[PDB]
């Protein structure tokens with residue numbers, strides 16, 4: 001099956017917007033982690049493949065995904081980076097867990113429809 005870029009955008013962008021809409025939980029994920037600004041210079045020593053909502057959105061807008069599972073992989077890369085880097089008591093870690101719950105719920109019916 002070939003998935004056209006606009007088909008993927010129409011189906012998958014609403015699932016990304018569902019993550020963006022989460023407040024407070026999406027706020028640390030709306031832009032790439034800037035380790036200098038945030039005062040966490042060890043970040044890139046631990047997270048080798050950074051990912052965030054704005055990068056995923058740009059990839060959808062520029063047709064960088066051929067298959068739905070590639071989009072899902074990037075969302076999960078974002079989650080796994082945050083669970084890897086952050087302590088389990090931290091805001092970012094617990095916010096990540098909430099976003100993963102939202103995403104699981106949103107992506108399932110969409111995948112059925114694709």
Ligand SMILES: CCOc1ccc(C(C)=O)cc1NC(=O)c1ccc(OCCN2CC=NCC2)c(C(=O)OC)c1
Pocket residue numbers: 024027028029032033034038039040081082085086092
């Ligand atoms: C200090 C440690 O922070 C982090 C550590 C790890 C990670 C990840 C993904 O692993 C992320 C962060 N945090 C951030 O990236 C971050 C970035 C910007 C934020 O807000 C943006 C601005 N707005 C809020 C203030 N006024 C208006 C506009 C936030 C935030 O607000 O989270 C609650 C977090």
